[PDB]
Amino acid sequence: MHLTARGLTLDLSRPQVMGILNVTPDSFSDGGCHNNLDQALQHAQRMLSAGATLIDIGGESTRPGAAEVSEQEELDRVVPVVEALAQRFDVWLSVDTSKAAVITESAHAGAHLINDIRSLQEPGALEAAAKTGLPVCLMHMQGQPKNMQHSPYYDDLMTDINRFFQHHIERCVAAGIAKNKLLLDPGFGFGKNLAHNYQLLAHLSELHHFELPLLVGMSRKSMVGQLLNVPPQQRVIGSVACAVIAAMQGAQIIRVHDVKETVEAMCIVEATRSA
Amino acid sequence: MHLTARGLTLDLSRPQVMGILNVTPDSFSDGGCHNNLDQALQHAQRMLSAGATLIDIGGESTRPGEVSEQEELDRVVPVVEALAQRFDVWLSVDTSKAAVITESAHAGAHLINDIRSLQEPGALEAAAKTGLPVCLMHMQGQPKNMQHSPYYDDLMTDINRFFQHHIERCVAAGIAKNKLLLDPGFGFGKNLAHNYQLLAHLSELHHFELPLLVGMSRKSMVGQLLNVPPQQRVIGSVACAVIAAMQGAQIIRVHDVKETVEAMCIVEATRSAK
Ligand SMILES: Nc1nc2ncc(COP(=O)(O)OP(=O)(O)O)nc2c(=O)[nH]1
Numbered sequence: 391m392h393l394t395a396r397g398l399t400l401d402l403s404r405p406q407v408m409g410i411l412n413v414t415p416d417s418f419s420d421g422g423c424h425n426n427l428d429q430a431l432q433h434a435q436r437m438l439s440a441g442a443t444l445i446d447i448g449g450e451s452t453r454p455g456a457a458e459v460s461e462q463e464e465l466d467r468v469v470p471v472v473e474a475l476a477q478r479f480d481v482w483l484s485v486d487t488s489k490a491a492v493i494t495e496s497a498h499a500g501a502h503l504i505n506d507i508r509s510l511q512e513p514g515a516l517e518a519a520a521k522t523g524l525p526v527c528l529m530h531m532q533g534q535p536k537n538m539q540h541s542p543y544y545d546d547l548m549t550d551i552n553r554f555f556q557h558h559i560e561r562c563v564a565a566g567i568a569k570n571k572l573l574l575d576p577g578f579g580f581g582k583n584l585a586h587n588y589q590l591l592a593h594l595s596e597l598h599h600f601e602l603p604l605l606v607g608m609s610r611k612s613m614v615g616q617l618l619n620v621p622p623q624q625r626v627i628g629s630v631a632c633a634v635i636a637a638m639q640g641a642q643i644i645r646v647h648d649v650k651e652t653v654e655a656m657c658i659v660e661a662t663r664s665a
Numbered sequence: 666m667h668l669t670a671r672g673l674t675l676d677l678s679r680p681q682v683m684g685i686l687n688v689t690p691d692s693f694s695d696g697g698c699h700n701n702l703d704q705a706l707q708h709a710q711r712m713l714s715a716g717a718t719l720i721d722i723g724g725e726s727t728r729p730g731e732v733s734e735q736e737e738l739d740r741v742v743p744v745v746e747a748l749a750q751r752f753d754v755w756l757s758v759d760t761s762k763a764a765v766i767t768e769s770a771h772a773g774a775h776l777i778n779d780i781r782s783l784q785e786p787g788a789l790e791a792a793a794k795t796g797l798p799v800c801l802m803h804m805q806g807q808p809k810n811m812q813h814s815p816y817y818d819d820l821m822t823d824i825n826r827f828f829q830h831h832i833e834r835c836v837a838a839g840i841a842k843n844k845l846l847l848d849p850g851f852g853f854g855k856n857l858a859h860n861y862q863l864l865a866h867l868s869e870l871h872h873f874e875l876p877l878l879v880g881m882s883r884k885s886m887v888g889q890l891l892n893v894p895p896q897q898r899v900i901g902s903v904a905c906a907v908i909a910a911m912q913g914a915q916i917i918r919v920h921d922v923k924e925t926v927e928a929m930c931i932v933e934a935t936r937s938a939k
């Protein structure tokens with residue numbers, strides 16, 4: 391069936407591509423590329439043209455060792471982009487933020503989905519998200535962006551992810567967010583070494599037991615970089631291969647920098663799965 | 666899991682990329698590109714540097730819609746000779762003709778890649794005298810009429826029955842079973858639905874306990890989905906390669922080696938993570 395927000399629907403029986411729109415100076419792969427409004431809008435339209443059905447707007451880099459972004463600065467980066475896109479296009483608008491104020495003002499500006507790598511743990515974020523009535527993506531992470539890659543360790547990775555998701559779904563529900571408004575992301579690269587990342591990719595389909603949509607983000611990350619020994623821009627193929635492996639296991643939403651390639655890949659996946 | 670020819674071993678616990686070297690004027694995606702001797706040699710080194718562990722040489726386009734024995738032999742043998750005397754890599758010959766098989770092996774080839782599964786006059790015998798590994802490919806019909814209404818009651822049952830028949834045929838001729846490789850022949854007498862059924866059910870073919878070779882690179886099964894020209898089919902072809910290798914397919918025959926190798930790395934990392 392379908393995920394819904396504000397009269398929009400999203401077909402969960404086919405892989406959907408979420409296009410990354412970073413509005414920061416220091417995002418790990420494309421910082422300073424889409425920093426001004428006109429450039430952001432052209433990039434969004436390019437991604438829409440290439441077949442993305444969601445645009446993920448993020449004004450805070452959460453790469454390992456990332457700097458803090460002030461509340462007002464994040465607002466200034468994100469909200470005018472949400473507003474301008476909401477007025478122009480028929481598409482899901484996701485906001486990659488952890489701040490209560492950005493959640494609320496983005497909702498006010500016409501956003502459809504709260505993509506929070508911190509699973510609504512920041513002060514006021516859970517209450518802010520609940521009041522919007524919008525779907526929320528919860529992401530697994532060990533540590534914070536400042537220390538997550540300092541020796542990641544698990545007795546059993548999948549058990550830990552399951553426990554984390556169980557705990558945070560309960561927390562969202564008790565706050566008044568209906569379970570069917572939730573998405574789960576196991577958080578590739580977030581407190582996970584290379585082995586952990588590929589273990590997780592190998593076992594991804596096990597997460598369907600929650601009966602919630604899965605969103606995954608592997609695009610151009612170190613889990614590809616470390617294997618191919620190439621810079622972020624040259625990780626398109628590796629990233630597409632990861633997306634194909636994830637989608638073959640029924641991951642519903644794929645978060646990527648390179649929309650055209652991923653969409654083409656997803657066509658081949660859909661034709662394979664429907665056969 | 667392990668394959669040896671001429672003292673050179675090929676690991677099959679990890680996916681292997683076979684690079685395509687067409688030496689024809691009319692191949693469906695790259696006819697005329699690598700026709701002269703020097704460009705054939707150039708293209709091979711590039712593929713080698715990109716990580717190909719087999720080079721596949723083919724002097725006859727077998728696309729939907731023939732070539733003389735003297736015309737075919739002159740295209741392949743001089744190319745086989747130079748590469749064998751230059752590089753430490755499995756050379757494969759994409760041929761059906763007995764003379765081509767015999768003279769190619771003499772020049773130093775390692776593998777017989779036959780889309781007709783040794784069915785031409787003298788081919789089975791000529792291949793036996795070499796002692797080399799053979800790839801047997803499934804095909805319904807002939808390149809002249811294979812794409813005229815492909816039909817199967819059950820696609821997979823036919824492929825299995827085709828392979829069973831040609832394995833026995835090879836063994837009876839002296840070719841040891843552990844020297845055989847199977848290719849279900851994507852795009853060869855198969856429509857769009859057939860090709861993707863085959864891709865979806867590919868892993869079922871492991872029951873023969875023989876290495877699988879697959880070739881989907883730039884084919885119409887991708888073209889019909891993406892509505893892009895052959896050379897713009899890299900991404901679709903890589904996606905097919907990933908799906909095949911995740912299902913344990915051991916050899917992948919491709920035009921775009923660098924891209925496929927990078928994708929196979931990700932596949933290998935995933936598979937060996939359990
Ligand atoms: N739900 C979800 N959100 C995410 N947001 C940012 C990044 C990192 O990608 P990018 O935005 O290009 O990096 P940066 O954090 O530097 O902006 N990854 C994910 C992810 O895997 N899942």
Ligand SMILES: Nc1nc2ncc(COP(=O)(O)OP(=O)(O)O)nc2c(=O)[nH]1
Pocket residue numbers: 685687689691692693694723725726727728759778779780800802848850851878879880881918
């Ligand atoms: N084993 C095997 N051999 C093959 N040889 C040629 C082609 C067609 O590709 P190409 O050689 O690039 O085209 P052409 O026949 O026009 O030379 N496909 C296969 C295949 O799928 N499997």
Ligand SMILES: Cc1cc(NS(=O)(=O)c2ccc(N)cc2)no1
Pocket residue numbers: 693726727728729851852853883884885886
């Ligand atoms: C036209 C046309 C269709 C078509 N199909 S195909 O799948 O691309 C194909 C190409 C080469 C070979 N040897 C077999 C099949 N190729 O050209």
Ligand SMILES: [Mg+2]
Pocket residue numbers: 412417448449450451452486
């Ligand atoms: Mg970002």
Ligand SMILES: [Mg+2]
Pocket residue numbers: 687692723724725726727759
């Ligand atoms: Mg050829």
